[PDB]
C-alpha cells in the first residue's frame, strides 16, 4: 500500500508534514 505523501495509512500531513492521526 503505497502512501499519500509518506504515511502509514490514514494518518494526516500537518503543516510540518509529520503523518498525524486524522481520526
Given at each position: 500500500?503505497?502512501?499519500?505523501?509518506?504515511?502509514?495509512?490514514?494518518y494526516?500531513?500537518?503543516?510540518?508534514?509529520?503523518?498525524?492521526?486524522?481520526?
Open positions: 500500500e503505497n502512501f499519500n505523501g509518506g504515511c502509514l495509512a490514514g494526516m500531513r500537518t503543516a510540518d508534514g509529520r503523518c498525524k492521526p486524522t481520526f
